[PDB]
Amino acid sequence: KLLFVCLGNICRSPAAENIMNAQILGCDSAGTSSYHVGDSPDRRMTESLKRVRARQDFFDLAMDGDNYRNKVKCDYTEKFGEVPDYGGQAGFEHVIDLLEDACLT
């Protein structure tokens, strides 16, 4: 069982969970903050080409350094030189770009 973790579990780790599901030989996601528990993934992140409920476990992968530190593991990124978090749509595609590289299997 693989668990992908970001801060609110509405943008990054929900994307990681679906990318990994598609790449997989067959995931879940959650968040360090429970402020968004029960919400659907961010409307902008579901919108794309590119199929994406927030919940707040120690499973058999952190999106940024704050999620990770400061079984636990961008260090599977092989092509693109964190998975970045108040932005326009281009930042959402970059998140997907990084997860298609990193998504490890």
Numbering used by the authors: 2 to 25, 30 to 31, 36 to 59, 64 to 65, 68 to 71, 76 to 77, 80 to 81, 84 to 93, ...
Lines from the paper:
Most cyanobacterial strains produce extracellular polymeric substances (EPS), mainly composed of heteropolysaccharides that can remain attached to the cell surface (CPS—capsular polysaccharides) or be released into the environment (RPS—released polysaccharides). Wzc undergoes a phospholyation/dephosphorylation cycle that affects its oligomerization state and is dependent on the phosphatase activity of another protein, Wzb (Cuthbertson, Mainprize, Naismith, & Whitfield, 2009). In addition, Sll0328 was identified as a low molecular weight protein tyrosine phosphatase (LMW‐PTP; EC: 3.1.3.48) and Wzb homolog.
The structure of Wzb was solved (2.28 Å), revealing structural differences relative to other phosphatases involved in EPS production and suggesting a different substrate recognition mechanism. One monomer was present in the asymmetric unit, with the crystal lattice belonging to the P312 1 space group. The PTPases signature motif, the PTP loop, with the characteristic sequence C(X)5R(S/T) (cysteine 7 to serine 14) is located between the C‐terminus of the β1 strand and the N‐terminus of the α1 helix, at the N‐terminus side of the protein. Together, the DPYY and PTP loops constitute the enzyme´s active site. Based on these characteristics, Synechocystis Wzb can be classified as a class I or eukaryotic‐like LMW‐PTP and is therefore likely to present a substrate recognition mechanism different from that of E. coli Wzb, a class II or prokaryotic‐like LMW‐PTPs.
